[PDB]
Amino acid sequence: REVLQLQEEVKNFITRENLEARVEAALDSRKNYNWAITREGLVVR
Amino acid sequence: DPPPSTLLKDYQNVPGIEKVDDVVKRLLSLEMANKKEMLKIKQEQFMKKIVANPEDTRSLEARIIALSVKIRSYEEHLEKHRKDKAHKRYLLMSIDQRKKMLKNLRN
Amino acid sequence: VESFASMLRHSPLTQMGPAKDKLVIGRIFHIVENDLYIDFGGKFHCVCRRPEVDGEKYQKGTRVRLRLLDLELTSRFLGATTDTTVLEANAVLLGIQ
Amino acid sequence: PRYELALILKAMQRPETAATLKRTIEALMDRGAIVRDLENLGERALPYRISAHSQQHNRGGYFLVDFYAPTAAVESMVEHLSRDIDVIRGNIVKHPLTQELKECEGIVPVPLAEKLYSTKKR
Amino acid sequence: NEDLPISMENPYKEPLKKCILCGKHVDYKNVQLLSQFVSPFTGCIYGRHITGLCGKKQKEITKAIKRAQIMGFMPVTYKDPAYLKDPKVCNIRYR
Amino acid sequence: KFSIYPPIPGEESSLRWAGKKFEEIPIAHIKASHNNTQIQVVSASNEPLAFASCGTEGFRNAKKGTGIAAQTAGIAAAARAKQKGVIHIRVVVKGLGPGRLSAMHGLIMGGLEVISITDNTPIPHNGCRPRKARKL
Amino acid sequence: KNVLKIRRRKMNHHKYRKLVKKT
Amino acid sequence: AKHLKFIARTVMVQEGNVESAYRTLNRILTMDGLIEDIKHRRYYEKPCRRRQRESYERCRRIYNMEMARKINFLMRKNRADPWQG
Amino acid sequence: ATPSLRGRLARFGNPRKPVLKPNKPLILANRVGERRREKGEATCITEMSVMMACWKQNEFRDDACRKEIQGFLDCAARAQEARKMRSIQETLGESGSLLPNKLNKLLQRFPNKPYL
RNA sequence: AAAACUCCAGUUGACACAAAAUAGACUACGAAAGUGGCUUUAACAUAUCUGAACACACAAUAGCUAAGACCCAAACUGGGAUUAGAUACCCCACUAUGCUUAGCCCUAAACCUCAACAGUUCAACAAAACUGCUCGCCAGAACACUACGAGCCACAGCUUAAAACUCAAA
Ligand SMILES: [Mg+2]
Ligand SMILES: [Mg+2]
Ligand SMILES: [Mg+2]
Ligand SMILES: [Mg+2]
Ligand SMILES: [Mg+2]
Ligand SMILES: [Mg+2]
Ligand SMILES: [Mg+2]
Ligand SMILES: [Mg+2]
Ligand SMILES: [Mg+2]
Ligand SMILES: [Zn+2]
């Protein structure tokens, strides 16, 4: 069952052909890893 | 000295290695992973070559081959790092224990 | 005849359980200028401070309702082979009767 | 095993940034890497001033990439990134989620130790 | 006989305390969370007694802080003035 | 409501001084030591405005490292600053010393307005090896 | 505890060093 | 140096309360544990007697915390003797 | 709040090395350290400073130094009366902190025991 | 206080083979010595115990050999103060050296002075008393971390280690 996840993800993995579009899509998009937490333990962004 | 392209120890019983992509086969090849998987493959090879009952780690011969593979690992580490005295001591003690258990098995 | 095990199993304390944050009614037996000692249940009496509000209405036999934290205040310190005690119990009141 | 390159470039425009990125991933593939994904953290003014190979930089562009490669490729790419001029910094690291978190049962209360000094009058 | 006690576990046992993030995950990129656990004026990170979390998480976050500082995600002297406007967890007294 | 932290060049700073923004305010730098203290005033763009010290005021070996001399130097520097047309000042203090606290009060008695105080004292993270321990 | 014996040893070692320096 | 100026270890004066500002600065520096570090870096501290001093400080903190626990736990009892006889 | 001391000392059952090496035995005693002075009195520094200022301004002219000289006298007087007031304050008892002698009385009423 | 520097001092901008605050009130790893900046790699023995001072391998700091490195500190040295004198504690400058390489030396209060292994609940002080097995060591003080002998890349060294005379103590 574990093999199945990274199996289908190969198509998600970029290549020499998908690069010329994934690079642009990623640099146009934005991503953030930051997130805080309160006294109880509830996440807040 | 097993080949690099040989997939990991765990991913052998699965029958999906034939239809799976060559990129996945390369990813699962032990050359990507550390030397631990290489020595695992070596241990399995020795167990299948010599031992009558495989996957029996409690056996003296299994312990001996494990220590021999570890000895080769330490020897390579030392020829790449002539100065690692900790690994030097470990190699010496490993060969001593190997001689000890060889005597016991001979008895 | 009644067995002591049965009296324990039906006792008020076995059903009381932990004393932390549990209401209970009690009365006083001795009182000082600024404080009063309530006998409520179990072994020890709990000390308390007279509130400026309703301070006049505190005399012998007064039934006051209050919570509590423990039944005996103790603590084991660094060189304490056995825990030391205070011979009291912390209890705070928020109403009477 | 998995490897994340956290990289910070100097502030410049999309065409040359894309050129740098494609050249870098080409170097990855040359070393034999397999790229998992690319993530743009965004453009930010780096916290403290630094000194590049020949100048100083008060801003930067944060990128990250996740890939798979053997070991030698690691230091080969490190020296590649050091030789590259327009790249401010780049660091290879392992992946955190690859190391499964040990199951936690919470904080245990530590009782005060005793019997350190034997009983006597002193 | 039946009224006698029996060998039995403690049901009154309250669940073991878990820190703010005993189960959650942390990485050197969550600069917001990593700067939540540091003094804003000096920039030096607080200890366990001030923070209120387990040693494993403390070690993880301090190592991540060092990594971020050295690579460039974080400064060392001054806490980021953009992330201090966040919930205050670590107890203090000077204010 | 008051913010103890200082403003940032990035907006927004809702507090000015003499109708001026925080950054362009002149900055005073003082270096404290067990033996002596040195004071100086500079513009926001590093133009050296004023400079004085206990030595220039005429304090000798033992007496340079005192608070009275520090506050006198502060008085002098404040006089020079107001002569040159300086009212407000951002304080910067560097290191320990007797006259550390005294120089600021000297400036105040001179008649300047301190807005903030930053202690940019040297802190090595195990960088160099200091002197050996002397036996008093 | 007392260190008189090791002071004796100290003096002996010092004198021996001086002796070898002379000879 | 490379870091920005006038952010860290600063205090904004209000109503010209320079004494309060400086006192708060010293207080925060001590709670962060700095001035001790400056006076330790002034003259060199050998590793051995450094470790000795630090172990002594740890033990002192432990003893003081235990005595403070006892004090805070028994100060409630310090009251007028209710039972004379 | 207190840090634990499981295996920090040199005990026979502890395999590893010791963390601590306390010179004196680590036991809570029934005697508390009595307080101590903080520093030596100093005051009127700014007063005498402005006094010397107006002195060197007016060549030792009392009718001109009046302000500085009176302020200095008043500050010294206030310092003396404050010393007396805080002395009687320490004698009658410091508020907010408990006194050593009565703390010791309480501790001997509720003493620690290392022994049984 | 003196001597010393003013090619001095302060802000600002650029810069290291140097040592790695805070975390750390944490007690983890390594057989031990030791190890607490960051990253990667390799890797952290033995699933009965003991066990070589006839061997093997490590072994802090210091020191030696030949190249290099120069922020800082500093033996030695020189100068200035103190002192009756100061070949020292105080102050200033610099060097071996502390650092990186390829070797050597193999010593410590190398002590937590408490041996490994499997277990249990009283001399004094110290860190409570003990059981079973095993190795090593000890037998009045001092002469003695000594002489002689033997081995060592060591040559003012290291390891092993007595003897003669003296005393009633130590
Ligand atoms: Mg001692
Ligand atoms: Mg520390
Ligand atoms: Mg050397
Ligand atoms: Mg040198
Ligand atoms: Mg040691
Ligand atoms: Mg020994
Ligand atoms: Mg043994
Ligand atoms: Mg010797
Ligand atoms: Mg010899
Ligand atoms: Zn936790």
Coordinates of C-alpha atoms in Angstrom, one line a residue, chain D:
Chain D
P1 CA 17.2 9.6 0.4
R2 CA 15.4 12.9 0.3
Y3 CA 17.2 16.2 0.2
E4 CA 15.9 19.7 0.5
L5 CA 17.9 22.6 -0.9
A6 CA 17.0 25.9 0.8
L7 CA 18.2 28.6 -1.5
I8 CA 18.3 32.4 -1.5
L9 CA 19.0 34.4 -4.6
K10 CA 19.7 38.0 -5.2
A11 CA 16.9 40.3 -6.2
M12 CA 16.4 40.3 -10.0
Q13 CA 13.8 39.8 -12.6
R14 CA 11.7 36.8 -13.6
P15 CA 13.5 36.0 -16.9
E16 CA 17.0 35.7 -15.4
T17 CA 15.7 34.0 -12.2
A18 CA 14.1 31.4 -14.4
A19 CA 17.3 31.0 -16.3
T20 CA 19.2 30.5 -13.1
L21 CA 16.7 28.0 -11.8
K22 CA 16.6 25.9 -15.0
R23 CA 20.4 25.9 -15.1
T24 CA 20.5 24.7 -11.5
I25 CA 18.0 21.9 -12.0
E26 CA 20.0 20.9 -15.1
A27 CA 23.1 20.7 -12.9
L28 CA 21.0 18.6 -10.5
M29 CA 20.0 16.2 -13.3
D30 CA 23.6 16.1 -14.4
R31 CA 24.7 15.0 -10.9
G32 CA 21.9 12.5 -11.2
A33 CA 19.2 14.1 -9.0
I34 CA 15.5 13.5 -9.1
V35 CA 13.5 16.6 -8.3
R36 CA 10.4 16.2 -6.1
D37 CA 9.0 19.7 -6.1
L38 CA 9.8 23.4 -6.1
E39 CA 8.4 25.9 -3.6
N40 CA 8.7 29.7 -3.7
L41 CA 8.7 31.2 -0.2
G42 CA 8.5 34.7 -1.7
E43 CA 10.6 37.8 -2.0
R44 CA 11.8 39.3 1.3
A45 CA 14.5 41.6 2.6
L46 CA 16.9 39.2 4.3
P47 CA 17.1 39.9 8.1
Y48 CA 20.8 40.8 8.4
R49 CA 23.2 42.3 5.9
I50 CA 25.6 39.9 4.1
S51 CA 28.5 39.9 1.7
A52 CA 28.3 38.0 -1.6
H53 CA 31.3 36.9 -3.6
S54 CA 31.9 40.5 -4.8
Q55 CA 29.2 42.8 -3.3
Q56 CA 26.6 43.1 -0.5
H57 CA 22.9 42.4 -0.6
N58 CA 20.0 43.8 1.4
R59 CA 17.2 41.8 -0.3
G60 CA 16.8 38.3 -1.6
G61 CA 14.5 35.7 -3.1
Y62 CA 13.7 32.6 -1.0
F63 CA 13.2 29.3 -2.9
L64 CA 13.3 25.7 -1.8
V65 CA 13.5 22.4 -3.8
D66 CA 13.0 18.8 -2.7
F67 CA 14.7 16.0 -4.6
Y68 CA 16.5 12.6 -4.4
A69 CA 20.1 12.1 -5.1
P70 CA 23.2 10.1 -4.0
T71 CA 25.7 11.5 -1.5
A72 CA 28.5 12.7 -3.8
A73 CA 26.0 14.9 -5.7
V74 CA 25.4 16.7 -2.4
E75 CA 28.9 18.2 -2.1
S76 CA 29.2 18.5 -5.9
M77 CA 26.2 20.7 -5.9
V78 CA 27.5 22.6 -2.9
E79 CA 30.7 23.5 -4.7
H80 CA 28.5 24.3 -7.8
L81 CA 26.5 26.8 -5.7
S82 CA 29.6 28.3 -4.3
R83 CA 31.1 28.8 -7.7
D84 CA 27.8 30.4 -9.0
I85 CA 27.9 34.2 -8.6
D86 CA 24.3 35.4 -8.6
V87 CA 23.2 32.9 -6.0
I88 CA 23.5 34.4 -2.5
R89 CA 23.3 31.2 -0.5
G90 CA 22.2 27.6 -0.7
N91 CA 22.2 24.8 1.8
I92 CA 21.4 21.1 1.5
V93 CA 19.6 19.4 4.4
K94 CA 17.6 16.2 5.0
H95 CA 13.8 16.1 5.3
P96 CA 12.1 16.4 8.7
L97 CA 9.0 14.3 8.0
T98 CA 11.2 11.4 6.7
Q99 CA 12.2 10.9 10.3
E100 CA 8.9 9.7 11.9
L101 CA 8.2 11.4 15.2
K102 CA 8.5 9.2 18.2
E103 CA 5.1 8.7 19.7
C104 CA 4.7 11.0 22.7
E105 CA 2.7 10.1 25.8
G106 CA 3.0 13.6 27.4
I107 CA 5.0 15.0 30.2
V108 CA 5.6 12.6 33.2
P109 CA 5.8 14.2 36.7
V110 CA 9.3 13.8 38.1
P111 CA 9.1 12.9 41.8
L112 CA 11.7 14.4 44.1
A113 CA 14.7 12.2 44.6
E114 CA 15.5 10.9 48.1
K115 CA 18.0 8.8 50.1
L116 CA 20.9 10.9 48.8
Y117 CA 22.2 11.5 52.3
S118 CA 21.9 8.8 55.0
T119 CA 20.2 9.4 58.4
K120 CA 22.4 10.7 61.2
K121 CA 22.5 13.4 63.8
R122 CA 24.8 15.8 61.8

